[PDB]
Amino acid sequence: GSSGSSGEHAKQASSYIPLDRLSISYCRSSGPGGQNVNKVNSKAEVRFHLASADWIEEPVRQKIALTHKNKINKAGELVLTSESSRYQFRNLAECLQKIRDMIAEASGPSSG
């Protein structure tokens, strides 16, 4: 062929997760009888307008809109929170880990 894939770009789903494209909020966590969380005030919350996620695939954007609607607040902004650690980026890393998995399950099956 006139070449034919000789470069370095063949990717279905993402892994990078652009923190600054998203919204971040740390927090302290309120809960009346949930987990342990006595004084460890290190929660990560992440918000993004899913429909504006040019970094997500078209078929996956509209998936998260529906299939993860329960994480959407109403506005089509997807909001979720993940906390278990004293560290900043560790809790935030789990937030982004779900976001990747939420994209995987919307993109195609693989193993699971």
CA distance 3 to 100: 32
Domains of the chain: which residue ranges? 22-108
Sign for the pseudo-dihedral over CA of 60, 61, 64, 66: negative
CA distance 19 to 33: 31
- Assign domain 22-108 to its CATH architecture: 2-Layer Sandwich (3.30)
Q: What is the dihedral of CA 28, 32, 37, 40, to 10 degrees?
A: 30
Report how far apart, in Å, the C-alpha atoms of 12 and of each of 9, 31, 51 are.
Answer: 10, 38, 19
Phi, psi of 59 (to 5 degrees): -75, -20
